Design a protein around this ligand. Structure first.
Ligand SMILES: Nc1ncnc2c1ncn2[C@@H]1O[C@H](COP(=O)(O)OP(=O)(O)O)[C@@H](O)[C@H]1O
Ligand SMILES: Nc1ncnc2c1ncn2[C@@H]1O[C@H](COP(=O)(O)OP(=O)(O)O)[C@@H](O)[C@H]1O
Ligand SMILES: Nc1ncnc2c1ncn2[C@@H]1O[C@H](COP(=O)(O)OP(=O)(O)O)[C@@H](O)[C@H]1O
Lengths: 375, 56, 55, 375, 375
C-alpha cells in the first residue's frame, strides 16, 4: 500500500479513531473506538464468529453484541481493548503499522499525563514504533486551518479543551476546559426522545440515537425563535428511519440537543456554555493579544458540523466582547477531520523532524519520556 | 468551641422531627382505610323450601 | 423507632463527640506540638539568648 | 357525603392500582390493573355475565376471561381501559365521584410525556374532576419514608426509576431509568418453572405464577452461597398450592428469578442491574451530595418485599462504593404502598393546594398543561 | 450576647469575612464571602428550602448550590450580596445592631475607589451605622504586630498590597501591588491536579481544591532541591480525603502551586514574585528609611502559614539586599488573623475616635466623603 516510511497519524477519542498516514489530508479509514462482545449464548456450530469484535466489525455484528468504548473523556481506561482496535487499524485496514513507521498521537494540553505515558509505552513495546510524538490538538487544528493564532475549540467526544494560542505560543492561563462534548449532547437527546416515547437504552439503541443526532440536529443562530416555531409546528419535524423500518419523528429536540453547547445546564453542568468559555479564553489574555484572538475563533473537532454553529458562536462572542472590535470565526470544511489533518501536517513538516522521540531515547528513559520530550 | 456541634446535631433533629411529624400527622388524623371490615356471610338459614324460579 | 430516634440523637451525639474528639485530638497533637515547638523555639531563641548574651 | 373535599388519591401501576382518599394511611382498595374479556361462547341465558370486567371483577371471573393490562413499563397504552378502572376504583369502590373532588395521580419523573398528559386529560374530560395534579412517584416515596434526601429505587412491576433527590431537589442528570421490572421476574419464573416440569403460558397460569412469586420468592443477600445449597438439596425447596390442588416446589429458582434484578441478562436485558444503577444515581451527583445519598438508599414500590432485597441492595452498593463511606438502605413497612401513602401526604399539605391544575386552566391550555403545572 | 457599646470590625475579602467586636483578639465568626443559589429543579412540596443561602448557610447546603463571591480582586462589586452577608453577620452571629455601634471596614490602598465608597454607603444607608471608617490592612497589620515601621505583605484572596510604612507614615511611591493571591494559587492547583487525573470544575469541586491547598501545601525553602526529591519519590507525597471516601495523592504539586508566589509566571502574570515586591518597596525608599524597613518585613494574612515562607522570604530578600545590612521577618502566630486584630486595636484606640465619618457628615456629603475622611 505504501512505498515510504512516512509517519502514521492517529486521532484517538471516545467516539472514533481517525487514522491514516502522514502526507495525506484525510484519514484513510475511520475506526470506531469500540470493542464488541456477544451478550448471547451460541447454539449453532461452524458459524465462524469472533471472541470479540472491533471497530467496524463491532458495529456490523452489533445486533447481538454489547458495545463498549475503552476511552472516557479523552482517557484510555482499557488499553487492552485499544491494542486490539489498533492492531486492526494498522494491519488489516490501513495496511501500515508503527513497526515500520514513526507515529504521531493527538492530545489535549491538560489530558492527564499518565494517559500519554501509557500510549507511549504501547506504541513502543506492542507495536515497535521506531519513534513517537504526542501533539497538541489545538496545534494541529491551527496548522490545518492555516493559522498560528486563535482559540481552539477542539470539541472532542468526551471533553472540550478550549486553548488560546498566539504567535505559535500557548497561553495556558487562559485555558477554559469544559466537561461537555459530543457524547454528552447524545445523552441529552436520548433523554428528550425518551420523553416523546422512544427510549434508547441498549447498545443498538445507543448507536441509533448517536446517528440521529449526527444527521438531524442543528444549533441555529437563535434558539428561542427557532423553538417558538419548532414547538408550534410540524413543519419543523423530521422523521428518521430506524433499522427495523419504523420511524421516529423529532421536533424541537432536533436543536435542544446541540443547544447544550450553549446551555450545559441541560445535562446538569455548572457552565455558561462554549461561547462564554471561548470569550474567557480571549478575555483572560493580555489586551495586545485579545485583538488577534477575537479575530481568530477556531472551531475544530466534532459537533461543529451542526448548522448555524458558525453564526451562533460569532454572534454570542460579539455580544460578550467589547464594541469596535471585530470578532471572526473559522469553521472550515476540514471540520472533525482537522485534528487528524494537522497531525499529518505536523508529522511531515521539516521543522518537526527533530521533534520525534526515537526508540533509543525511549528505552533509556522509559514511557515517562513523553512528559519531557513532547509537552 | 462546642457551639456548632450543638447547632448541627439540632439541625439534623429538627429536620428529622419535621419529616416524621408530617407523615405521623396524616397517620393519626385519619385511620379508617388502614383498618378492616366485617365481610359477613349468607348461610340461608331461612331457606325452608324451593324458590319460585323454574330452575329451583 | 422512637428508641432509634433517641439512639440517632445519641448516636449523632456520639458522632459529634467523636468528631469533636478527633478535632480535639488534632488540636491536642497541635496544641502539644506547639507546646513542644514553642519549647523547641524557646530553646532555639533561648539558646540564641544565651549565645547573644554571651556575645 | 364526605367530611371535606379532599383529593382522591390513586397510584396506577403496571401491576396493581390502589386508591383511597387524601389524608388516610392506606388505600381503601387494591385492584390489579386489569380489564377482562370472555374468550368463550356463552351457551346458557340469563347468567348475567358482563362483556368486560374490571379490576377485581376481572380477576375473580378469570376462569373464562383473557386478561389485559392497560399499563406497561409505567405508562398507559390503553386509556379506555384505564377509564373503566378509574370509574370502578373511584366511584364504584371508594364511592366518590371525581366530579366533586380533586384527584392526585402519579408517574415517574422520566415517564414519557404522553402518559402524564393523558391522565390529566381523562380525569378532566371524562370524569369532570375539578382539579388535577400528577405526583412524582419518587417524591411520594420520600414523603411516606420521611426523607428529603436519598435515591429512590422503586423496583415496581413496570419500571425501575433510580432517582437521586437531595434536600427536596431532583438531580435529573443522574437518573438511571431502567426497563427492568417485577413483570419480567414473573415471566422469567413462568419459563423457569416450565424447565422444572410445570409449564405456565395462559392468563390463569400467569396469575398463578405471580401468586407463587409473591409468596415463595426471595432475593438472597448472598446468592452464591444460597444457590450452592439450594441447587444441591431439596431442604431449600418450598411448596406452593395451586388453585386445583396441585403442588409445585421451587429450589434455587425461588431466588434466581428475583436475582434478575441484579442479573438482567437472565431475561435478555442489557443492564448493570438495580444496585449499579443505585450506585450511579449516587455517583453521578456532586461529591457534596453523594455523602448523603450513600447514607440514604430509599427503597420503595413492590418487589421490595422479597427477603434479602434490602441487604442485597446494600451489600452490592457497598462493594461498588468508596471505603470509609457509610452505605445505608432504608426499607420501611410502607413498602409497595409508599407511593400511595406519600400521595395522601402530598394531597393534604397546605402548600400543595397551590399546585393544582383547576378545571378552568385545563380547558384554556389543554392537557399539555400538566408540563406547565405539575412537572 | 455582648456587654459593651463598642465598635464593630469586619475585614471583608474575596475569600472570607472576619467579623467581631473591637476590643477582642478574634472575630466572633468567619463568614465566607458567599451567597449561594440552587441550580437544580425542586421536586418536593412543604419541605422548606430557601431561594438563597448566605455565608455559612451557602457552604452548608452547597451540594446543590452554585456559589458566588461578591468581592473580586480586593473590591466589592455585588453590593447587594454584601448587604445580605453583613445583615446575617451582624444580627444573627455577632448579635449586634450597627445602628448602635460605629463600624470599621478594610481595603488595600491600591484598590479602586468605588470599594470604600460602596462599603461606606451600605453601612450608612441600610444599617444606619452612627459612624464609619475604612482602614488600611497594612496599618492594622502593623498595629497587631507591635510596629510603626515595616513592609506589609497582606496575602489577600484577591490581591497582595505590598506597602512600606515608616514611623507611622505612608511611603506610597514604593507600593508594589501584585495581582497574585490565594484564589490564583487555587486556580493553579485545579489545573495541576487535572494533570494528575483529578478534574475539579464545579463549585463543590472548586471549594475542595481550596481546602486541599490549605491542608497539604507549602512553599519550601529551596524549590529546586525540594522538587528534586518530590518529583522522584512517594516519600514526599500526601493524601487528601475527598468528601465521598476517595482520596487524591499530591506530590511536587504540593509546593509547585504556592511556588507561584515566587514565580507568578505560573499563572500568566508578569512578575518576579513577592520577594521582588518586598525588595522594591524597601529599595524605592530613602536610604535612611531602608535600614528600618529591611529589619521589619511583615507577614500578614494567609500564605504566611506555609512551611518555608518566613525563612524563604528572609533568604530571598537578603539575597537582593546589600551585605552588612540585617534583613528580618516578622511572622507572629496570629497568622491569617492579625489584620482582624489590628482592626480591633485601631477601632478601640483613643487616637482613632476623631477619625470616624459620622452619620451627619455622611448624610450631608454622600459616600464620596470616605475619600477625604479615611486615608
Ligand atoms: N453533524 C454532526 N452533529 C453532531 N456531532 C458531529 C457531527 N459531525 C461530527 N460530529 C462528531 O465528531 C466526533 C468525532 O470526531 P473528533 O471528535 O474530531 O475526533 P476526536 O474525538 O479524536 O477528537 C463524534 O462525536 C461525532 O458525533
Ligand atoms: N409479597 C410480595 N413479594 C414479592 N414481590 C411483591 C410482593 N407484593 C408485591 N410485589 C410485586 O410488586 C409489583 C407491584 O408494583 P407497585 O410498586 O406496587 O406499583 P405501584 O407503585 O403503582 O403501587 C408486582 O410485580 C408484585 O408482584
Ligand atoms: N494552612 C494554610 N497555609 C497557608 N495559607 C493558608 C492556610 N489556610 C488558609 N490559608 C489562606 O488564607 C486565605 C485567607 O486569609 P486572609 O489573609 O485572612 O484573607 P484576607 O486578606 O482577604 O483577609 C485563604 O484564601 C487561604 O488561601
Amino acid at each position: 500500500d505504501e512505498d515510504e516510511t512516512t509517519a502514521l497519524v492517529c486521532d484517538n477519542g471516545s467516539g472514533l479513531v481517525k487514522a491514516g498516514f502522514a502526507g495525506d489530508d484525510a484519514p484513510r479509514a475511520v475506526f470506531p473506538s469500540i470493542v464488541g462482545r456477544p451478550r448471547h449464548q451460541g447454539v449453532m456450530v461452524g458459524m465462524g464468529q469472533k471472541d470479540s469484535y472491533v471497530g467496524d466489525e463491532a458495529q456490523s455484528k452489533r445486533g447481538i453484541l454489547t458495545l463498549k468504548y475503552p476511552i472516557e473523556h479523552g482517557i484510555i481506561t482499557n488499553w487492552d481493548d485499544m491494542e486490539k482496535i489498533w492492531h486492526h487499524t494498522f494491519y488489516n485496514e490501513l495496511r501500515v503499522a508503527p513497526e515500520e513507521h514513526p507515529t504521531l498521537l493527538t492530545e489535549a494540553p491538560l489530558n492527564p499525563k499518565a494517559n500519554r505515558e501509557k500510549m507511549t509505552q504501547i506504541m513502543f513495546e506492542t507495536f515497535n514504533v521506531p519513534a513517537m510524538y504526542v501533539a497538541i490538538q489545538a496545534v494541529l487544528s491551527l496548522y490545518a486551518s492555516g493559522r498560528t493564532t486563535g482559540i481552539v475549540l477542539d470539541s472532542g467526544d468526551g471533553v472540550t479543551h478550549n486553548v488560546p494560542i498566539y504567535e505559535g505560543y500557548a497561553l495556558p492561563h487562559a485555558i477554559m476546559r469544559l466537561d461537555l462534548a459530543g457524547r454528552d449532547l447524545t445523552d441529552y437527546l436520548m433523554k428528550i426522545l425518551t420523553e416523546r416515547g422512544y427510549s434508547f437504552v441498549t447498545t443498538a439503541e445507543r448507536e441509533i440515537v448517536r446517528d440521529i443526532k449526527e444527521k438531524l440536529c442543528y444549533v441555529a443562530l437563535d434558539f428561542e425563535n427557532e423553538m417558538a416555531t419548532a414547538a408550534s409546528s410540524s413543519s419543523l419535524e423530521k422523521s428518521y428511519e430506524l433499522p427495523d423500518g419504523q420511524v421516529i419523528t423529532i421536533g424541537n429536540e432536533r436543536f435542544r440537543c446541540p443547544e447544550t453547547l450553549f446551555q450545559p445546564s441541560f445535562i446538569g453542568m455548572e457552565s455558561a456554555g462554549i461561547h462564554e468559555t471561548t470569550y474567557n479564553s480571549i478575555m483572560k489574555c493580555d489586551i495586545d493579544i485579545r485583538k488577534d484572538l477575537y479575530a481568530n475563533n477556531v472551531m475544530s473537532g466534532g459537533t461543529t458540523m451542526y448548522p448555524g454553529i458558525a453564526d451562533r458562536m460569532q454572534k454570542e462572542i460579539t455580544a460578550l466582547a467589547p464594541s469596535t472590535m471585530k470578532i471572526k470565526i473559522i469553521a472550515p470544511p476540514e471540520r472533525k477531520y482537522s485534528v487528524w489533518i494537522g497531525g499529518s501536517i505536523l508529522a511531515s513538516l521539516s521543522t518537526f523532524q527533530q521533534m520525534w522521540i526515537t526508540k533509543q531515547e525511549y528505552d533509556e528513559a522509559g514511557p515517562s519520556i513523553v512528559h519531557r520530550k513532547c509537552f | 468551641m462546642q457551639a456548632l456541634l450543638g447547632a448541627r446535631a439540632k439541625e439534623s433533629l429538627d429536620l428529622r422531627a419535621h419529616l416524621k411529624q408530617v407523615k405521623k400527622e396524616d397517620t393519626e388524623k385519619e385511620n379508617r382505610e388502614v383498618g378492616d371490615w366485617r365481610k359477613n356471610i349468607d348461610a340461608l338459614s331461612g331457606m325452608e323450601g324451593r324458590k319460585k324460579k323454574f330452575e329451583s | 423507632d422512637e428508641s432509634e430516634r433517641g439512639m440517632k440523637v445519641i448516636e449523632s451525639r456520639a458522632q459529634k463527640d467523636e468528631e469533636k474528639m478527633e478535632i480535639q485530638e488534632i488540636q491536642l497533637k497541635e496544641a502539644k506540638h506547639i507546646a513542644e515547638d514553642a519549647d523547641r523555639k524557646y530553646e532555639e531563641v533561648a539558646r540564641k539568648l544565651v549565645i547573644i548574651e554571651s556575645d
